[PDB]
Design a protein around this ligand. Structure first.
Ligand SMILES: *[C@@H]1O[C@H](CO)[C@@H](O[C@@H]2O[C@H](CO)[C@@H](O)[C@H](O)[C@H]2NC(C)=O)[C@H](O)[C@H]1NC(C)=O
Ligand SMILES: *[C@@H]1O[C@H](CO)[C@@H](O[C@@H]2O[C@H](CO)[C@@H](O)[C@H](O)[C@H]2NC(C)=O)[C@H](O)[C@H]1NC(C)=O
Ligand SMILES: *[C@@H]1O[C@H](CO)[C@@H](O[C@@H]2O[C@H](CO)[C@@H](O)[C@H](O)[C@H]2NC(C)=O)[C@H](O)[C@H]1NC(C)=O
Ligand SMILES: *[C@@H]1O[C@H](CO)[C@@H](O[C@@H]2O[C@H](CO)[C@@H](O)[C@H](O)[C@H]2NC(C)=O)[C@H](O)[C@H]1NC(C)=O
Ligand SMILES: *[C@@H]1O[C@H](CO)[C@@H](O)[C@H](O)[C@H]1NC(C)=O
Lengths: 576, 48
């Protein structure tokens, strides 16, 4: 279907998916009569547990169809929402095209404010009752499955039991998250202060030097990433960053050389060759013909000895990095190729994405570019280029940590009933002021529903995977080239001509889900929990640079200023 | 007589462009107006 869009392909989807789901349900019902606390062999007990879930079928039929209808309605309203200019209501814009481009390119305060306010006011108002009832349905469903709430069901992903002291209680996750965020707060404070100081020049008379930042100036709809502010926060614009886009042009690099170069890099690292069958039954480059196919990169796990990658080639570095990312996914896929079907997966949700990130990062270093030959040896990069690159990386990495933590904390606290239904939005914004340090431009009462505007929230998805993986990557960094005796800066780490790092990686790759992720961490990193020290060590030079640059500044913020307090009027009424 | 009509050009140039813009606006808004059901405000219907 991805290769060929036909109605026959769509009905083949429907039939195959229905058959697979029916087979899974019938197998679960047949195996449910096997008791659990009798098999001491863990590698089969894990399969029994992974096949034992009764899912939403415990819930009533009418309630089940109502829930499915509500989910479909939420997805449809998110996908087809539209707002537009009051001045000329005859032209209207969706969210994915234009509006995202507007918020990622526009420099007008009024335009950004209007778009940010209008999208929420015209989507969240519709979405509010649906979520208010969906949370109740999910809570009932979770309680029907011996869980405290749906948040407990989500947290059960990391839960490990009966492995003689390596167990991890579900409640322990919260403690780890808060302890990690405590050490992250000081660096985020400095970064936020520097960003506010830099934005003071772009939007004068709109930002208080000690207040929080207005929400509609973050470069994104919600602020999940701060990359779009790079042009407005460049430390040294006189010298450009590391760009080699003309290097492949000079050598006339077609859209085939990328994969061969990736294979050569893998061979130099120590990993074996690649399957010719994979080269044949794959989609290295988009045909470009009249047949539509999605250009979104994705690795496939067909099994049986064949894999493939779907991504539209192009002569640019990002394509090289994405190829490395997907190739890492594919390597991890063959890593558990000799495992049962129940074990043909990663240790948890944050394992597949952690491998591709480190793989791309190892090849993204300028040292690798110099070694390849594209970057001539005589050319050199000073400290300012490194600072610019580190700031660019930080604007993507650090920015999402407080946002992700705050979102997950809000969802967890709302799923356990600790927040009264009539006191959701207020509490939400309070966290935004005190965790993230962002203040809304206009007050929002309880009729709105702001987090429901995000795709992950309105589609029943867990957001914690973006947090822990972000840590694991950097932790993997300490396990990646420190064993490979790398002595230079951590941002210059590379593992070419290092077979020990490859062996250490393979030792955990060739495990699948057969062993707990804690066991893999102890096997490679040597710990039994996620650590934040590697991340702090990675950004030490930029941390020192910020500390030097923040002497004439006020690190931190006060959660009382607002862009509307200067023109507001207070009222006081005493009826009695 | 059929060729003698001085036409609407006798008006001032700014007034002429204002009239032309307004007529075009009327035509466009009539051609592209749309209303739809509050029950499902995601699908909306034209006139023709
Ligand atoms: C748990 O049971 C499985 C299922 O038999 C065992 O896995 C097999 O082990 C035998 C030898 O004991 C091998 O010949 C098979 O290749 C293994 N694969 C299968 C069939 O799953 C496993 O050994 C048992 N756990 C123990 C006893 O350590
Ligand atoms: C989910 O699976 C469990 C398996 O135990 C089912 O619970 C059993 O329900 C049957 C009757 O349906 C009883 O005879 C057993 O005593 C129950 N065992 C218990 C309490 O664990 C449960 O009904 C299943 N739900 C559905 C509809 O799939
Ligand atoms: C780091 O970047 C700065 C950019 O100027 C340079 O270091 C400073 O350079 C100016 C003029 O040369 C002088 O103040 C000093 O040589 C440096 N300032 C210090 C040490 O405080 C240099 O290009 C790079 N390397 C170092 C060690 O600063
Ligand atoms: C270690 O591995 C690298 C990875 O490429 C190899 O570098 C080769 O040899 C020289 C540089 O040393 C280059 O001109 C070749 O193009 C590289 N090709 C090969 C054979 O991979 C080499 O094996 C070692 N060199 C180092 C230390 O980088
Ligand atoms: C397989 O790898 C070996 C060792 O790097 C190499 O000599 C050989 O040319 C490779 N063959 C393929 C299929 O690339």
């Amino acid at each position: 279907y991805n290769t060929n869009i036909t109605e026959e392909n769509v009905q083949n989807m429907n039939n195959a998916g229905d058959k697979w789901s029916a087979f899974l349900k019938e197998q679960s019902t047949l195996a449910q009569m096997y008791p659990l606390q009798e098999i001491q062999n863990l590698t089969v007990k894990l399969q029994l547990q992974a096949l034992q879930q009764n899912g939403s079928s415990v819930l009533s039929e009418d309630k089940s169809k109502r829930l499915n209808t509500i989910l479909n309605t939420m997805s449809t309203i998110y996908s087809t929402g539209k707002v537009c200019n009051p001045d000329n209501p005859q032209e209207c814009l969706l969210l994915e095209p234009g509006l995202n481009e507007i918020m990622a390119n526009s420099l007008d305060y009024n335009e950004r404010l209007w778009a940010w306010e209008s999208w929420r006011s015209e989507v969240g108002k519709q979405l509010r009752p649906l979520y208010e009832e969906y949370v109740v349905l999910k809570n009932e469903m979770a309680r029907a499955n011996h869980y405290e709430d749906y948040g407990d069901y989500w947290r059960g992903d990391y839960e490990v039991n009966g492995v003689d002291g390596y167990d991890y209680s579900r409640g322990q996750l919260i403690e780890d998250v808060e302890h990690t965020f405590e050490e992250i707060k000081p660096l985020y404070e400095h970064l936020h202060a520097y960003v506010r100081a830099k934005l003071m020049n772009a939007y004068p008379s709109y930002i208080s030097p000690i207040g929080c930042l207005p929400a509609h100036l973050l470069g994104d709809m919600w602020g999940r990433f701060w990359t779009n502010l790079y042009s407005l926060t460049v430390p040294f614009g006189q010298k450009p960053n590391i760009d080699v886009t003309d290097a492949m042009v000079d050598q006339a690099w077609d859209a085939q050389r990328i994969f061969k170069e990736a294979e050569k890099f893998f061979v130099s690292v120590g990993l074996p060759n690649m399957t010719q069958g994979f080269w044949e039954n794959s989609m290295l480059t988009d045909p470009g013909n009249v047949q539509k196919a999605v250009c979104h990169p994705t690795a496939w796990d067909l099994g049986k000895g064949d894999f493939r990658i779907l991504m539209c080639t192009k002569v640019t570095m990002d394509d090289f990095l994405t190829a490395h990312h997907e190739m890492g996914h594919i390597q991890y896929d063959m890593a558990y190729a000799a495992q049962p079907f129940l074990l043909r997966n990663g240790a948890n949700e944050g394992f597949h994405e952690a491998v591709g990130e480190i793989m791309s990062l190892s090849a993204a270093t300028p040292k690798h570019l110099k070694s390849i030959g594209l970057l001539s040896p005589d050319f050199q990069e000073d400290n300012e280029t490194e600072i610019n690159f580190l700031l660019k990386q930080a604007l993507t990495i650090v920015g999402t940590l407080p946002f992700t933590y705050m979102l997950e904390k809000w969802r967890w606290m709302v799923f356990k009933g600790e927040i009264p239904k009539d006191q959701w939005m207020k509490k939400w914004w309070e966290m935004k002021r005190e965790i993230v340090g962002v203040v809304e431009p206009v007050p929002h009462d309880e009729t709105y529903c702001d987090p429901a505007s995000l795709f992950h929230v309105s589609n029943d998805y867990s957001f914690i995977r973006y947090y822990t993986r972000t840590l694991y990557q950097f932790q993997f960094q300490e396990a990646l080239c420190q064993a490979a005796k790398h002595e230079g800066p951590l941002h210059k780490c590379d593992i070419s001509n290092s077979t020990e790092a490859g062996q250490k990686l393979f030792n955990m790759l060739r495990l699948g889900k057969s062993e707990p992720w804690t066991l893999a961490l102890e096997n490679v990193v040597g710990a039994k929990n996620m650590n934040v020290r590697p991340l702090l060590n990675y950004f030490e030079p930029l941390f020192t640079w910020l500390k030097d640059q923040n002497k004439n500044s006020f690190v931190g913020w006060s959660t009382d200023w607002s862009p509307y307090a200067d023109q507001s009027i207070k009222v006081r009424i005493s009826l009695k």
